[model samples]
Target: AMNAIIIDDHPLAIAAIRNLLIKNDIEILAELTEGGSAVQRVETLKPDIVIIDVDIPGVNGIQVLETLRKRQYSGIIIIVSAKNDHFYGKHCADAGANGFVSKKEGMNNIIAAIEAAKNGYCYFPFSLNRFVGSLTSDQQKLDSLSKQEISVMRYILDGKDNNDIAEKMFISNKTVSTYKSRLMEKLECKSLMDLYTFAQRNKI
Candidate 1:
């Protein structure tokens, strides 16, 4: 019978959590669309548990966690995010969050995470642990890449096309292609899309 609040930007994510709560006969004290709003609402509602997305418009969940900590607010915090970055999860834990759950794991995991947090227990998705372990080891090797490779990865993260990257980097299109191919092979990325996904998860 614990009251809960949900804070997330995506309409679909909100709806899914809302439906799950309703189906489980859980009481929702509030549904917020941004971290700032959630923070403001939390002060007044003082819900038993707060489910928040890591990446939200205006003050992201981590910032909200910091604010809450600074204010000496004590409540269960569960971070629900599509960004399954290991660092993000570790960051949440360091920030005093009680639980972390990825969107890919679906609502069932979310429910368990919320319950665990509400009971003053820390929870992290089991699947994420392995991914985080692998990434941690690989991160040490990522530094071996040359400065040019790192620069190219930065451009790729900026959503620039190959021609755009070449122009920005002041390199010939063929050279840029060659660099990209070599870096992809070095990183063990099968394609540009795979690189993007890996970068999103690894944040590098």
Candidate 2:
């Protein structure tokens, strides 16, 4: 039987998932209401599977999944989210999740994800929402930026003028302006407000 750890804050989601796991003969090793201690607990307990919610407190589920993959956790990781979003599906995929089950799709989808994971397969919604999809694309653009461009963006967000940034980075004003222009184009931001919004969404 597969042993699993559940990380979700909602009582209804937790109870429903636990019932499904029990009915399917999967042992419930632990349940976490937050993502704070997720990596440590999973490393120590060593469950065969991990079922996590995207909106969990203290670090969010995708970050937890990324860290789990970084630390080489070999167990199956399934993302169970309230939002039926393909962006999150792709995000979790990039983080090395075995499957994704949207809560709005009901418990059957959850079971399907588990079954797929057990068989060394993967699952995700075919439909994509353009609005949310753009957010992840912004994440990709953020990831593609150079170290100097990132530093320039941070200084811009910190309310520093071009002269101040140039002086601090030991670059000329023209160079700072050039980096700013490149940042605006690379991030697809029309103005300082747009740039700040992008930074806010990506947590930069």
Candidate 3:
């Protein structure tokens, strides 16, 4: 019975959420493809709910929350992302978003999130323990990384070894190891998979 708007970087992501909402008899007033239009659209329309992607390029998705919240927006704000639900979900909540659902969690959870969000409740993981037991950092750990470190991290996520990354970035193998160690420490990732998870979650 409430109106909503969809904002995301990819048309497919928008369509996916749109179709899901449609199937559930949820109505969306508009679809915005980037963050530049989000501020105005939300301010003007102020739909009952807002669904956004975390890694939007034009305007970062979190900034959208900051903008609308500052305008004293009173509506549902949900963050959709490929990151870990609890971790990224907390960020969205901290940013004043009502809820966050991982794109990887599939439709059941996403649907539940929208419904819970519609009712003025938050949703993320299956249990509080999961959210609590997850890793913690001061803030967005990615923000603390240097440009070179981020660049190296991306290469690492791409399945490149130290030598391959070194060859591509023109850094020494030893230097790559140094970067990797430092990157892992900064991100608090105990393993490469954890590092990969962090990058994918942040869309870095």
Candidate 4:
């Protein structure tokens, strides 16, 4: 009764989770290792649970989890980071993750976490209170952005004015203006400073 996608940056890691789900017949639809591609897959595939490795590059799993939540995705998310610090579990929980399962827990715990998340439960070692307290209701809204919109936002954040971005992307300045307007509406950024703050916080 569960569908899932495993997001990890390692081939072996993906294989481990994939084998577990395969044996259990959980029906995984995709195994993505790139953070940049996660949103579209999660949004379109609409899995019941998303198993993520917090160390994912480009955009870490915590940020991805937040973006998915901002997209109004209510699916369960489980963090499977290998870091010994154990603080990432709490961070992910604060960012709206449903559970955490460290790699130190061994292979079986992955399946355990999957089963728990499938039944509206969590398998986190730490409590969720510490993390959830810091989450804000007015976080940035970049989840609905198109690829071009994200490209424009990245350029805007990197100190590129309209003309610069337009020339680089081969679009006209008018197109850049349209994209900027859409970026502002979607990200709630009214000025370059606001965009800077948003970009700084999101690390895009």
Candidate 5:
């Protein structure tokens, strides 16, 4: 049977997952209640599966996923979270998660995700391809911007259209559009709504 470690901060949620895993005959290798110690512990344990919670205390879920992938971990990873938004799902998928199960979908989704991973398949509660006004740019991604890009972001956030932004920056419309595209790609923003949401989270 496959062994797994669960990383979640809530007592009740942990218990619920434990029960479900037991029912599935998957052995429980370990359980973690916080994110600070999660990556190190999971690395050491190296369980066949890892069930992660996005909102866990310390380090957060996305960071853990990125770190694991960077370190070349090949084990199955399933993100189970209360954040049912497609934005979170997209991030998890991009970060190398095999599956994403929203906690609101209850235990059924969780089991399905696990089953899909066991079959070397991917699972998500929503469309991972579409932009759904999700995610905030982290400090690292923000630091990638040029001064001019930052100015464009501020102007765009303040309701400036492309032509207005071009006038303020004394650049051509195509230049302004180019800046917008570069910044959006750097920030991992799929649409203007995503950019706005990212700005709102980072207070840009």
Candidate 6:
């Protein structure tokens, strides 16, 4: 049986989750009513999966997930929230949540989410799924940078410092620096390292 932990502040929600686990033949290693307690339990127990509510009191579920990721916990995480916002679901995914299930869909979707996460897949309900599909397609388009910026980006990825890039491109060092700054702003990266990773991931 897959080991799981439930972290929700509501007593009824916790009991509901517990009943679902028992009915679905999954094993519950622990149940926590607070986000802080859930973090502690996760560190100590290291269960295969953690089912956390988004609106837990004290530390919030997303913050707890960030804590777990910072500590290098590799187990899957399922975010259970009553929020119907697509932005919340996107944030959860960006924060490394393995699955997101809206409480409105009831326990059946929760079970499906848990099962999908256990098998190393991600799950999102159709409402959030539609938003993600459109958003990802828009993100995939490299319209953020101009053709000149793209050329400069190629040089930046080649390990050329600003001075070297300026010399190679036959432009002033200040101009090269301007390009770098504009590229960073356009890409929303804080540093050249972030740009490098983003470029590599997007095949830019």
- Name the lDDT value of residue 12 in candidate 2: 95
* Model 2 ranges with Cα > 4 A deviation: 128-204
After TM-score superposition, what is the CA distance of residue 67 in candidate 5 from its true location, in Å?
0.3
Best by lDDT: 2
> Which window of 10 residues has the lowest lDDT sum in candidate 5?
128-137
Candidate 6 backbone collisions, by pair: none
Compute the lDDT of residue 69 as modeled in candidate 5.
92
TM-score of 1: 0.66
Shift of residue 130 alpha carbon in model 5, Å: 3.4
lDDT tens digits, residue span 18-132, model 1: 9998887778988888665767889899887788887675676777887887887798888887745443565577778888888876889888877776666788744343346
Model 3 / residue 118 / CA error / Å: 2.8
lDDT at 6, model 6:
91
Model 2 over residues 1-204: C-alpha lDDT tens digits? 689999999999999999998999999999999888999999999999999997687766877998999999999999888755443576677679998888986888888988898888988765322346556587667656554576577678678898988887667999988888887898999987897787677554
TM-score of each: 0.66, 0.66, 0.66, 0.60, 0.64, 0.61
In terms of TM-score, how similar is model 2 to the real structure?
Answer: 0.66
Q: 2 or 3, which is superior by lDDT? A: 2
Instruction: Give candidate 6 misplaced runs (Cα > 4 Å).
Output: 126-204
- Write one digit per residue (lDDT tens) for candidate 3, span 157-204: 667888898887666889888988887888889976886677565444
lDDT per residue as tens, model 4, 7-27: 998888788888888888889
The clash numbers for all candidates, in the given order, read 0, 0, 0, 0, 0, 0
Candidate 2 shows a clash count of 0
RMSD of each: 8.0, 8.8, 6.8, 9.2, 11.0, 13.6
Clashing pairs for predicted structure model 5, backbone only: none
